[PDB]
Amino acid sequence: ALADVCRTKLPSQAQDTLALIAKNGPYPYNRDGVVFENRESRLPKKGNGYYHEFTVVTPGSNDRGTRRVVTGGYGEQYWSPDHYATFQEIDPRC
Numbered sequence: 001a002l003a004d005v006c007r008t009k010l011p012s013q014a015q016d017t018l019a020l021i022a023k024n025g026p027y028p029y030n031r032d033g034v035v036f037e038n039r040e041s042r043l044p045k046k047g048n049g050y051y052h053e054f055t056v057v058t059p060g061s062n063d064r065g066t067r068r069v070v071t072g073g074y075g076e077q078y079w080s081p082d083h084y085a086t087f088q089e090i091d092p093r094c
């Protein structure tokens with residue numbers, strides 16, 4: 001049961017991250033692209049290595065912070081402002 005968000009409504013940092021995803025980087029962190037395990041199953045329960053996580057920069061700071069995009073195996077994209085506590089499916093069509 002998944003909240004949905006239009007790509008245009010995403011903070012501009014989140015959109016930068018999707019742009020880096022679409023050209024496969026370079027990414028600003030070695031941790032970008034690591035397997036997201038979906039341990040809590042807030043996202044569709046899928047096989048090993050389906051999901052990958054990518055940093056969204058906090059505005060102001062250049063630390064990683066708590067903002068993230070998880071991608072799925074067919075290019076589904078998920079937004080998390082709250083360090084994997086909740087997810088919204090990104091609709092790239094709006």
Ligand SMILES: Nc1nc2c(ncn2[C@@H]2O[C@H](CO)[C@@H](OP(=O)(O)O)[C@H]2O)c(=O)[nH]1
Pocket residue numbers: 031034035036037038039040053083084
């Ligand atoms: N909550 C949660 N975090 C995960 C899961 N799988 C990987 N992570 C997080 O993804 C990141 C890379 O392994 C780590 O957090 P981080 O964003 O602080 O680096 C790790 O804690 C998961 O299934 N659930």
Ligand SMILES: OC[C@H]1O[C@@H](O)[C@H](O)[C@@H](O)[C@@H]1O
Pocket residue numbers: 028029030031032
């Ligand atoms: O040790 C490797 C790590 O260095 C950190 O400073 C960065 O966030 C990443 O590039 C990586 O996850």
